[PDB]
Design a protein around this ligand. Structure first.
Ligand SMILES: Nc1ncnc2c1ncn2[C@@H]1O[C@H](COP(=O)(O)OP(=O)(O)O)[C@@H](O)[C@H]1O
Ligand SMILES: [Mg+2]
Length: 234
């Protein structure tokens, strides 16, 4: 499957934070959207997800323009989303966190939802934390729970907004592995970070954004030799 955003633009108080941004992610690849803080990465994700209204642009899947679909209908079309800020229910156990999102799986019985919850905990290596409250988890464990939550809906595409934010150096490795596992599973993965070199390593290719503009696209090696890129990090 192919997910495409075309000519996205968004302004707050007239200030252009995203201008003419176009990108694509396909099933079974990891695509980066990388750039400094305030560059417009989250705003772009919001427009793809349907969280904020666009001033301009189109969101499309295959031969289907879905720009007019609300967030809930876009999710049902297979777009999943991991927010930058914490999204875990802090007072709820890891298990209750998953069961809560699995309630949207109208295709499953109540007992198949529990099966799925157990499968997800095993897949994300959090099954030993079944009854731990979200509040008591490390950043790395929290993130594994939040990513599991995002997959409960069964998306074809997952937008990961700074999945490494707030996670210790060590837990970063398992998350990277899980992301690679998602891609191998056939999901299209789109991922943001301000740490270019750290996240670049996990992408097949990446768009670089600065002050609302797309300034380059390429593989990791291409990006790291790109004059327009260097020009931003002089
Ligand atoms: N509701 C809002 N009103 C005004 N400015 C905003 C609003 N939301 C975000 N911004 C600004 O837009 C810019 C881009 O934000 P964002 O997309 O979060 O960048 P990134 O995610 O790459 O750090 C930031 O400078 C931010 O302060
Ligand atoms: Mg952001």
């Amino acid at each position: 499957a192919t997910l495409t955003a075309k000519n996205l633009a968004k302004a707050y108080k007239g200030r252009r934070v995203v201008e003419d941004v176009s990108l694509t992610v396909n099933s079974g690849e990891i695509v980066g959207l990388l750039g400094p803080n305030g560059a417009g990465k989250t705003t772009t994700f919001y427009m793809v997800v349907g969280i904020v209204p666009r001033d301009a642009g189109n969101i499309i899947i295959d031969d289907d323009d879905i720009s007019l679909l609300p967030l809930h209908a876009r999710a049902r079309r297979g777009i999943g989303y991991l927010p930058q800020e914490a999204s875990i229910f802090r007072r709820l156990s890891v298990y209750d966190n998953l069961m809560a999102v699995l309630q949207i799986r109208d295709d499953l019985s109540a007992e198949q939802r529990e099966d799925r919850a157990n499968e997800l905990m095993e897949e994300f290596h959090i099954e030993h934390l079944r009854d731990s409250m979200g509040q008591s988890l490390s950043g790395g464990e929290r993130r594994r729970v939040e990513i599991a939550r995002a997959l409960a809906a069964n998306p074809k595409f997952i937008l990961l907004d700074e999945p490494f934010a707030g996670v210790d150096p060590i837990s970063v490795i398992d998350i990277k592995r899980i992301i690679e596992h998602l891609r191998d599973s056939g999901l299209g993965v789109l991922i943001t970070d301000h740490n270019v070199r750290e996240t670049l390593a996990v992408c097949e290719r990446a768009y670089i954004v600065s002050q609302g503009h797309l300034i380059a696209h390429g593989t990791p090696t291409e990006i790291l030799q790109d004059e327009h890129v260097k020009r931003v990090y002089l």
